[PDB]
Structures are given as C-alpha cells and as structure tokens.
Amino acid sequence: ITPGICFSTASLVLRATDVHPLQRIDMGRFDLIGLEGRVSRYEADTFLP
Amino acid sequence: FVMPPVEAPPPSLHACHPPPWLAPRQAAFQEQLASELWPRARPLHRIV
Amino acid sequence: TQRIASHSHVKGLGLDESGLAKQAASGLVGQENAREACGVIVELIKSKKMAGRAVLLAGPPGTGKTALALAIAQELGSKVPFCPMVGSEVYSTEIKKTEVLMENFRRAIGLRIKETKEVYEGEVTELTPCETTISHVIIGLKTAKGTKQLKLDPSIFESLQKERVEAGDVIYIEANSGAVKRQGRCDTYATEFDLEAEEYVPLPKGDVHKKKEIIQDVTLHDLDVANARPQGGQDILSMMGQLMKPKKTEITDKLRGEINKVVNKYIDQGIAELVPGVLFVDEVHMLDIECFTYLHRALESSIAPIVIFASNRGNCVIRGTEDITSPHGIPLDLLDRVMIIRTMLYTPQEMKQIIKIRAQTEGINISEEALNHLGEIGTKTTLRYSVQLLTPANLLAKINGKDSIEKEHVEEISELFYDAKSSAKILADQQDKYMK
Amino acid sequence: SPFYLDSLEEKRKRQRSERLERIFQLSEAHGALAPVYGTEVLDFCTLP
Amino acid sequence: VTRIERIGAHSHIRGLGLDDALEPRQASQGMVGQLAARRAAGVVLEMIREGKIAGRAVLIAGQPGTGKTAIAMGMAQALGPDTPFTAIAGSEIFSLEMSKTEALTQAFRRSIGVRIKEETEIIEGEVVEIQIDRSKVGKLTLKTTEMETIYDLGTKMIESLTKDKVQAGDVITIDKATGKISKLGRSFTRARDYDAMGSQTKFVQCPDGELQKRKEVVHTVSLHEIDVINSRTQGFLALFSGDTGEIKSEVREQINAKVAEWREEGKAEIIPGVLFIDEVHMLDIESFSFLNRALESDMAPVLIMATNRGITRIRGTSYQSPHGIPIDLLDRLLIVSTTPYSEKDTKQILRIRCEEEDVEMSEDAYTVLTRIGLETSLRYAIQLITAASLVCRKRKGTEVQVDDIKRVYSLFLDESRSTQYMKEYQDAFLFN
Amino acid sequence: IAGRAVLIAGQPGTGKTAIAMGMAQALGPDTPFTAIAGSEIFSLEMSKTEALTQAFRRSIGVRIKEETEIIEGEVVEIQIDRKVGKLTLKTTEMETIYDLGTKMIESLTKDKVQAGDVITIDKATGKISKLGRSFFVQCPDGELQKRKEVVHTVSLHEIDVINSRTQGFLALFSGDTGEIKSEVREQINAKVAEWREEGKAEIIPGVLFIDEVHMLDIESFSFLNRALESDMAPVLIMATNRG
Numbered sequence A: 001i002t003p004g005i006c007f008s009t010a011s012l013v014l015r016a017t018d019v020h021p022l023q024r025i026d027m028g029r030f031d032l033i034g035l036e037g038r039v040s041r042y043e044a045d046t047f048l049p
Numbered sequence B: 001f002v003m004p005p006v007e008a009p010p011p012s013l014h015a016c017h018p019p020p021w022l023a024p025r026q027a028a029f030q031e032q033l034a035s036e037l038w039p040r041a042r043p044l045h046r047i048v
Numbered sequence C: 001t002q003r004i005a006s007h008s009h010v011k012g013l014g015l016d017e018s019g020l021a022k023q024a025a026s027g028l029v030g031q032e033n034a035r036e037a038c039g040v041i042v043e044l045i046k047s048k049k050m051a052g053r054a055v056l057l058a059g060p061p062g063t064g065k066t067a068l069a070l071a072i073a074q075e076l077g078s079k080v081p082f083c084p085m086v087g088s089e090v091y092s093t094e095i096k097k098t099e100v101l102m103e104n105f106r107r108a109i110g111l112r113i114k115e116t117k118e119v120y121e122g123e124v125t126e127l128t129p130c131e132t133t134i135s136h137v138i139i140g141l142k143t144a145k146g147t148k149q150l151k152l153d154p155s156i157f158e159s160l161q162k163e164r165v166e167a168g169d170v171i172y173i174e175a176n177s178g179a180v181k182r183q184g185r186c187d188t189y190a191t192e193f194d195l196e197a198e199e200y201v202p203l204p205k206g207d208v209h210k211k212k213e214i215i216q217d218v219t220l221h222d223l224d225v226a227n228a229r230p231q232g233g234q235d236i237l238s239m240m241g242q243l244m245k246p247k248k249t250e251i252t253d254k255l256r257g258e259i260n261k262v263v264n265k266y267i268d269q270g271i272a273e274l275v276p277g278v279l280f281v282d283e284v285h286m287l288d289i290e291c292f293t294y295l296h297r298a299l300e301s302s303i304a305p306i307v308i309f310a311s312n313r314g315n316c317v318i319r320g321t322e323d324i325t326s327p328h329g330i331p332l333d334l335l336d337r338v339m340i341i342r343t344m345l346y347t348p349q350e351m352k353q354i355i356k357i358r359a360q361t362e363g364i365n366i367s368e369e370a371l372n373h374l375g376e377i378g379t380k381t382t383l384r385y386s387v388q389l390l391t392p393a394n395l396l397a398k399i400n401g402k403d404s405i406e407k408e409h410v411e412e413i414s415e416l417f418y419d420a421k422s423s424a425k426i427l428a429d430q431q432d433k434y435m436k
Numbered sequence D: 001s002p003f004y005l006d007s008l009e010e011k012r013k014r015q016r017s018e019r020l021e022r023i024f025q026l027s028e029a030h031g032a033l034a035p036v037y038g039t040e041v042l043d044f045c046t047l048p
Numbered sequence E: 001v002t003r004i005e006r007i008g009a010h011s012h013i014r015g016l017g018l019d020d021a022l023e024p025r026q027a028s029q030g031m032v033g034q035l036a037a038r039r040a041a042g043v044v045l046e047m048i049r050e051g052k053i054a055g056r057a058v059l060i061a062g063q064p065g066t067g068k069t070a071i072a073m074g075m076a077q078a079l080g081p082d083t084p085f086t087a088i089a090g091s092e093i094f095s096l097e098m099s100k101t102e103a104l105t106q107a108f109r110r111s112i113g114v115r116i117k118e119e120t121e122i123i124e125g126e127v128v129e130i131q132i133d134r135s136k137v138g139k140l141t142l143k144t145t146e147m148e149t150i151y152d153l154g155t156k157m158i159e160s161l162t163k164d165k166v167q168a169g170d171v172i173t174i175d176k177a178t179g180k181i182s183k184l185g186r187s188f189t190r191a192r193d194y195d196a197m198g199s200q201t202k203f204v205q206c207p208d209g210e211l212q213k214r215k216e217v218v219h220t221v222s223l224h225e226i227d228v229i230n231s232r233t234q235g236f237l238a239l240f241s242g243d244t245g246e247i248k249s250e251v252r253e254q255i256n257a258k259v260a261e262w263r264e265e266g267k268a269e270i271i272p273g274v275l276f277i278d279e280v281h282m283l284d285i286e287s288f289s290f291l292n293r294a295l296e297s298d299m300a301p302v303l304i305m306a307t308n309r310g311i312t313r314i315r316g317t318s319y320q321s322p323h324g325i326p327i328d329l330l331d332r333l334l335i336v337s338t339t340p341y342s343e344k345d346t347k348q349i350l351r352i353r354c355e356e357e358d359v360e361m362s363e364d365a366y367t368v369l370t371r372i373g374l375e376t377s378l379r380y381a382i383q384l385i386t387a388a389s390l391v392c393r394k395r396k397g398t399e400v401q402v403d404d405i406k407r408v409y410s411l412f413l414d415e416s417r418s419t420q421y422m423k424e425y426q427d428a429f430l431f432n
Numbered sequence F: 001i002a003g004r005a006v007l008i009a010g011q012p013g014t015g016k017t018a019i020a021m022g023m024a025q026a027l028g029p030d031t032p033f034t035a036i037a038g039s040e041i042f043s044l045e046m047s048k049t050e051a052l053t054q055a056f057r058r059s060i061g062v063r064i065k066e067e068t069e070i071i072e073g074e075v076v077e078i079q080i081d082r083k084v085g086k087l088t089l090k091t092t093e094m095e096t097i098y099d100l101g102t103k104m105i106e107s108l109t110k111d112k113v114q115a116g117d118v119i120t121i122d123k124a125t126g127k128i129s130k131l132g133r134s135f136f137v138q139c140p141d142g143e144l145q146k147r148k149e150v151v152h153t154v155s156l157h158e159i160d161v162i163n164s165r166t167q168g169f170l171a172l173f174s175g176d177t178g179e180i181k182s183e184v185r186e187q188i189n190a191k192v193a194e195w196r197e198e199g200k201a202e203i204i205p206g207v208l209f210i211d212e213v214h215m216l217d218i219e220s221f222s223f224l225n226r227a228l229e230s231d232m233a234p235v236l237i238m239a240t241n242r243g
C-alpha cells in the first residue's frame, strides 16, 4: 500500500474555464437534446400556441 | 488469487485556494453514485 | 501577443480606398496583384450574401500565402470567425475525416447573440422557504449598497440546498436560469472560528441586482457539440455517463438541420445575427482524395463559409491516389471550383524591405551595410533564412556590447548556422558517413 | 397617509413592472424550443 | 436579413422545369438545356412518387460542369419535403466507428420515411389541491376554465405525483393508458411574482374546454431512426451524437416486422424515398458488392448516383471499368448521360445566376463572360460574376461592364493559366 | 521570439544528443524542456497532430504566484464534542489552542490525528499531511502559522487537461487525454493572455527537443510548419543524422 500522488497546481488554473454569468449568454435557448424525454409534441404544437 | 503488487489511491488535485464549489459538488456526485450503485456491486464481493 | 511570431508584422492587406495595392503598407511588401485579389475576397466576405465560394493561393514557398490569409483575417477583424486549420489535421483517431471537415466548416460559421443578463449577488442574510411542499423561497442578499429581499421560484431551493447555502455565505443567483453558485463565506465571519477550512470572500461592492447587456459570438459547431451529449441529469445512466471519457462523435445531419432551424428562428426573432466567416486550410495538399471529394459536395452547400486554400506543391501526386498527378496536388474537379490567386517570388529590394520590417517588428537596430549583407544572403539562400538570422546576430551584438547589428555579427551568424543548400552540399560531399 | 412617499412608491411600481416583464420574457424563452422527436414519437417507436 | 441559407451553387434551382407530359422546358424553374437528362430525371421522379418498385438505381453520368448535381438538386426540390431525400457523398461511408456496409445500410434506412399516427386520451388541467393520507390513498383536484373534478388516487399514481413534485398551481397532463405525468407549466397568481425563475419553469394559461381530451400526434421518422431508438436503452441519444455503432441485424428484422404490423394496423405509412450518392467513384469494390445485393431488398429506396469518371480504376482493385463502377452493378442501373452546354445555354445559365445574385450586367459583358465560360469553364464564369459585381461596386458603379470582367479575369486565374504560370516556374514549386 | 526552430545535423556519435542534454542542463528546472523521440508521436490514443500539439503545449509554462497560510507544528491535545472542537498545537517556541470549525473538524476526523503527531495544515483547504511523530521528525521551531508564497509553473497542456473534464487532471498521469477540443484550447489561450495582461501570471517559454526527427512523416512535418507560426509556440530543437 502506497500513499496517493498529491498533484499541486495553481488555484487560478481551476478557474480557467469559469466565465462569470454577466459575461456569457444563456445556452439553454439552443438546448434541443435536453427536451428529449421531458417535452412532448402536444406541449410544443397544440397547448403552448 | 492474483493480487496487484502495489495498491494506491487515485491521485489528488490540490490547490491553495480552489473554487469552493468544486469539492462539494464532487462529494455529492460520489455520494449519489455510491448510494445508487454500491448495492448492485455486492455480488462481486468474493472476487474483490 | 507579447511574443513576436512569424506574421506578427502583418496588420492588413495595405490597400487604398480604390482597392489598389500600395507598395509597402500594413507590413506587406510587394505582391500587389495578390493583395488586390485578397481585397476583393475580403469585400466578398463582408457582403454576407454568398456561401461556399472557395479561393486557392498558389505559389512557391515563402511567397506570402499564409501572410496573405492572415492579412485577410486582420482586415475582417475579430468579429468575423477566422478558423485556421492545417490539411494534416483531418487524420483524427476518433472521427472520420469528413466529420473533421464538416466540424471545421461549422466552426467557420458564426452567430452573434445580443442578450441582457441579470444576476442577484450578495451575502445571504436570510433564507426562508415558505410552506403552502414549498410555495416559494424568500432570500435576503446584502451588498455594500444595501439589502434586497427576493422571492425565489421553488425550484431554486433544491439548488440552494445542493450548494449548501447558509446565512453569511456570498452567493449569486441567475435570474434566467435559477443557477446558484456559493462563492465562499463572507469575510466578516472570518473570525467566527480560529481554524476552519473555508474560503472567505469580500462582500460584493455594487448593487444586489446587476444588469449587463452583452454581445457574445458563438459558432454553429458550439451548438452542435452542445447538443451532441446531454448535460446534468440525476438519473443513474446520466451520472454514469458523466464518468465516460469525452470522445468526438459524428454528429448527425438531422441535428445539424434542427440547429439550423433554431438559428433561423432566432435570427427572425431579431436576437441573433449571422456572421458567415472564413475557413483557412493551409497545406491543403495533405488532404487525400476522399477529403477533396467531400469538399466537392461541402462547397456546394448553401450553408458553407468562404474557404481559402494554400498550396506550394507543383505537379505532384494526390495523397490518396496511386499515380494520379494534378497541378497543385488538388484534383482537377476541385480546382474547377476555386478562384486561384497567384503569388510571385520577391525581388532583392522586396527582400530588403521585408527584412527591415521584420527588424522593426523584433525591436532590432540594423545598420545599412548589415541590411545589405542580409539581403545578399537572402538572395543567395532564402528570405526566411535571412529573417531568422536577425535575432542571433542581435544577441551577438548585445553580448559584444553594441546596441546595433554590424556586418561582422551577420558574418559570424552566417558562419555559425547553415541554410538548407549548404547543409545539402555538405551531405552530398559526405554521403558515406551520414546515415542512409 | 402622513408617511407616504411618492418616490418610494414610484420605485416600487417600476420594480413590479420590471419583474412582470422579466416573468413574461422568461416564460416565452423557456417554452420556445420544440423537440426534434418528442416523448410521443419516442414512446411509439420504442419496442419492449 | 441574412438567414443561415445563403446564395449557393444551386440556389437558383427550384425544380426540373417539366410540364405535365414530362417534356422539359428550355428554361424553367432555374434549369437550362439538358433536355434528355431532365426528361429522364422526371421519369425517375414519377417512379419515386409511385413508390411501387423497390431498389431502383440510376446513374447520372457526364463531363464535369454538365449539370449532374444540378439535376440531382432539381429532383430533390421537385420532390416534396414529405418524401425523404438523403444526399450523401461517396467519401462519407468511410467511418472509424462503423463499417462501410453498415454506413450504406444506415443511409438506405435513412432514405425510407415512416409516418406514424397515434391517438391517445389524456386528462389536462390545473392542479388545485393534492391531499395524501397516511402514501396509501389520496385525492387530486383538477380544473379547467369551464370544469373541475376530483379524482381518487392509487399507490402508483401517488408515487408518480410525488416523484414529479406536482403541487398546486401546476398545469399537467396525465395519460389515461399509461399514467405518465408531464408538466406543461404553472398558472400565474399574484403570489407567484418570482424574482428568479428556474430553467424549466414557465407560466401558462389554464386550459379551457373539457378535462378529458384526445391527443393526435403525426410525425415522420425513418427506419434508421427506429433502429437507433431500439438499439440500446437510451438509443435516441445516438440520434444526436451519431455514436450508433453497428446495429444488430436481428434488431433490424424485428423493426421491419413491427413496421409492417403498424402498416397493417393503420398506425403508420411508408414513404420510400431517394438516396443520392454524389461522386460514387470514391466507393470501394466492397461497397459496390454490398450495393449489388442491398438493392434487392423490398425495403430499398431509389438510389440516384453521379460520377464524372471515364474508364478509370475501381478503388480497392487494379481493374479498369467504364465509370469506376464494376460492370455487375452497372447492369443493375440505368445511365442518364449529360451533354456539354452550348453558347446559348451557357449565356442563359449566366443570366439565371446573375438574377439569383442580383447583379446587373451589360450585354457586351454577357458576351465576354460567355466566351470566357466556353473557353475555360462554366464555374469560372460563375465565380467571375460575383467578382465583377464586387469590383463594380468598389468603383461606385451600378452595372457590370466589360472592364470589370477583364479586371477580375486578370486578378483571378482559372486552372489552365495557373498551370501555365507554374510550368514557367516549375523548379520553384515543390515535388514536381 | 516565438516558434524558432533549430536542427542539429551531423554524423553518428558527434555529440548531437550531448549538445541537447547540455542545453537542457544549462537551462534550470524553471524553464520547461520537453524531450521526446520521433517515434513517440505515433499513438493509438490520439492523432499525430494532436500528439505534436501536446508536445508543443507541454513546452510553454505559466508561472503563477499566490500566498497561503501554513500551520506546521506538533499536536498536543485534540478534543471533539457533539459540532465543536478544540486543537492544541505547539512549536519549540510557542504553544496555542485553536477553536475548530465544522469543516476542519471533519478534516481532522477523516485523517486520524492524535497527540504527538507532527502535521502541517493548509488553512484554506484543510489539507492535513502527517509528516511523522515526535517524542521521527523534530518539532518545528518558529511561528506556528506562517504566510508562504507558493509559485507554480503550469504547462498549457496541464491547464487544458485539468479543464477538459471533471476529474480531468487524472489524464495528466494516465494518458487518456483523447483529442482535446480546439475550443477548450482557444479558451485557455485567451484566459492565459488575460492573465498575462492583468499581471496574474507570467509566461515561461521553453524548449521541445525531438531527437531523431526523421521518424516523423510528411503529415507531422506539415503540421510543424504552421504550428511553429503561433505566438505560443516554443523553441523547437531537432536532431538527425540522415543524409
């Protein structure tokens, strides 16, 4: 039994992909795959209009 | 009967001031996955 | 870009208002006809009404095809998507070559979306769910400019509990999505314990409610990869899918068409704008016959961008074929679909001008005699070799104590380093000793 | 109404108007997209 | 505004330009000349529309620039969007994930559309009260703008309601047959003026009419989509990702039988379509061998193909065949030959392209451009159309003149001039 | 200057690899020096162009300095009651009792800490590592709580792999990187430029050494031709003995 490898990095690296909400748009308006299994043709075509 | 010669835990990522949301999110993900999957792994107990 | 690259001096095509090419402007020297053609191509790209038009830049090595493409990119600006790819980048080990080509095609097409974002940010002073199940959540956020009480949609309570949000924590809540991020504890509570594993963050300065109207550019490929795999999901299959290694996938044409329909809907609504953009393929001779055949169909699409090719090969064998030769390594059928821009070789005066421009860009002072010697070397061997001799010669000058390049430094560097022709002569003179 | 303030009530009604506009815009945005397939189609096409 | 669909190489083609007798007009729906080829395409299109005969193959052969892809796009446009038209290139079947035969099978099953028709009784209303006594038995109250009733719930209904966290003010629909509950939205009250909303919440009006309703859904799916749906547990995700793999033949046979059963029951209709493979010469000998026997199925669409090869080498072999296609497959297909265009046809095509791009050209400019197109190629002249339009706009002109065409002819080279200039400086270029 | 390429050519046994090793030794550990062979870019895990992109990005480092509070001492007494707790730590010069929070109590419970152990704690993270027992390592001498400046040099490849996916840093140790998307790489390049402009980080260009570069094929050479033209390209050094 060996101790694990402790890999140390800069704290700024973990925030590299992070973008503040005031600097990014809502990608949920293009979410097509998220509607599958949750949204029906009835809701989109007959009810909501 | 074959045992690995060495056994280690997975490598850990350490930062002095990490985003305070990453670790709790990973902990919750692991907890949910364990609560859903550990009962299903009981048959492999003798092999392990 | 703090560091100086090979084309760090190219700022534009250097044309005038009439489209005619100045002799030396925007870092470009000579190649007047090619620069005028690239100006016409830039005017084509700006007039967004044409799709799938393709251009080939054909000429000897070192004549400025990549520089001309980068000048086109600079002329367009950062608002127009310029996707640079190398012909050998289509040989992926995860997806087929045609998928790589179509992914780059969609990368070149850009979409501009104008949106106002609202975020509630501050330290939590109260978190009270209101029972009717929970009808709503009343939260209290504090900033330097005051306190605000907010009524939250009950679906946000689950997110708040997952994020472990308590009083004294500094959080933000997205108005449009209900996303909650707990970005640490407030530093006013830093002394509540002598030793806690907590990240203490200053209180936000502005108002609790922050509004910003932003314009963000996305490409069709971003929406494609966003709709290739699901995100989130509390099901066991979704969680186990989060552990799976992310692999590029051959996105279906059904998904592409549906995303095109969504984009058209949002363009009609008036919140989106389309920027067709440019895809630059360098070393296109590294594409094989299958890639060229797929390009035949892709360029004929009404959705494709403007594609610029570059080739320095002469009459050479197409990569995927056995013995079929073509004028630029490109099948005659694809050559029939492109407008060819020809780049010519440079005169000694043009080489001296380019060497001077490179010296100015690299922050190097060079004397007139040193510049003439470098130009003579470039005439003897290559423009690239002379440009690459500037920095080592400047380093020798700095070591010797001189702030300018003299002729002796250039001579010493030409002695220290060899060009392709001199090394080839040495190799031919010593064939037996070198490895075969 | 001795303690009534006109500016405070104007601010409050402006806030209410902004809240209602936000509710409308978000309700329109969250139901704008139609599924590629939909639950009915997938259920019909899914054999046991 | 600028939509995602912009002026392409075939944006001017709206159809085949035929009359009721399939006689091609000289210039109709954006097509010029190619009378025999257009008549053959119209006959094939009538064959497609009838749908009786399965696995028919047609090869559109001719010299480059003679309108093969133009004719294919005309057939696709003339054919309704109801009938599937899968257009793929020959190079797209070489995949790192599935074999060539699997790719061709998937394209074939993508070319047959299945229109489904499901009628389902549903309950639709806004939730007023949910009372559960103790998770054993409870009552649910639903309302519309014209109705309101109370329901007795069982164990599974209560569990499903608790799983979906249905509460008061939610507008939901419940399927009577299966009991599944999907939430449409929630009603707006004075107390629901939220400052922040979740990503899925939306406010809708209370439904009107009667609480019990019938839902009719009609959609068109392909056989390949049903195969991908039934390939794995969440196979519909592969309809987005494309990570289908090689579907088992047993699954395909089961789905064929189930589709036949639906067709007999009246719940589905078959719309056989067209698979267009452009530049088929890129297919290998194995792909041709598979195509030979794939066309013999009763669920095979019409296969339209296009090559511009002469007697050349078949890929994957050392043999020479008239189109790059082995003669066994060529005996299975009808060949439509395209002839080169004349001066009048070239001028008419240039006029149509100019009208499509909204470019005004003088008649002298048209004569010069037609001469260039005959001398070099039609596509070169088509590109020069836009080049000359841009140059004319640069000099603040309104109509393209001969000077603009000469200017863009000097600026942009065709293949012949570029090849000559390269031969002049052959030693400069690499790997001659 | 970015993307400068040098070839060391000569007969076998003439010090080419010796010259490369001397160049690597003259540079300190601070500057990255990635040494690979031409054969190493041929992989079943990724493409050749992806392999050369990872070779390039391994050669450019991002130096980030940050300050942390480090508590190093010998444990005297640990008390936890049903949550509240106390911790007593001592050095050779001072002794102190700490009032513990919930998270630090959990961290000390997870890693068994008893009296006499010499441990160091990172205050912001609770990272407790036991470095021996004293009554074997001598107890620390000076102040118990020290503010330290920690400097990390992180390669662009490391940033890309860490931010490629959740728990993605494991791929820095087990391969398994796949082919990182160009969007992630462009985002990382933009963020690194932002850091450099804002002073949060410094760029340390390094050296990529490809011994026996003649094993590369035409596709890899064509990729290198344009990969050297980026502003984030390192200095490329190659060696070959071929005529």
Ligand SMILES: Nc1ncnc2c1ncn2[C@@H]1O[C@H](COP(=O)(O)OP(=O)(O)O)[C@@H](O)[C@H]1O
Binding pocket: C006, C007, C008, C010, C027, C028, C029, C030, C031, C059, C060, C061, C062, C063, C064, C065, C066, C067, C068, C310, C312, C343, C354, C384
């Ligand atoms: N007309 C020019 N003006 C300024 N710099 C040039 C010109 N032509 C080439 N260069 C420079 O010479 C170098 C090599 O040219 P390159 O763009 O690689 O030519 P090609 O793409 O034809 O190989 C580049 O760094 C480029 O900046």
Ligand SMILES: Nc1ncnc2c1ncn2[C@@H]1O[C@H](COP(=O)(O)OP(=O)(O)O)[C@@H](O)[C@H]1O
Binding pocket: E009, E010, E030, E031, E032, E033, E034, E063, E064, E065, E066, E067, E068, E069, E070, E071, E308, E349, E352, E378, E379
């Ligand atoms: N009969 C026609 N009518 C109108 N345009 C045509 C006709 N034939 C060819 N074209 C045009 O010529 C160009 C090349 O022909 P296309 O059919 O696309 O390729 P090919 O025939 O060489 O396979 C297309 O842009 C098309 O619009």
Ligand SMILES: Nc1ncnc2c1ncn2[C@@H]1O[C@H](COP(=O)(O)OP(=O)(O)O)[C@@H](O)[C@H]1O
Binding pocket: F011, F012, F013, F014, F015, F016, F017, F018, F019
């Ligand atoms: N100029 C030199 N000074 C010191 N040691 C050398 C020198 N040249 C070669 N060597 C040593 O002799 C051996 C020869 O290897 P080397 O010359 O590097 O092979 P290659 O020609 O493939 O680079 C090496 O172990 C190297 O350390």
Ligand SMILES: [Mg+2]
Binding pocket: E068, E069
């Ligand atoms: Mg064609």
Ligand SMILES: [Mg+2]
Binding pocket: F016, F017, F018
């Ligand atoms: Mg060696």
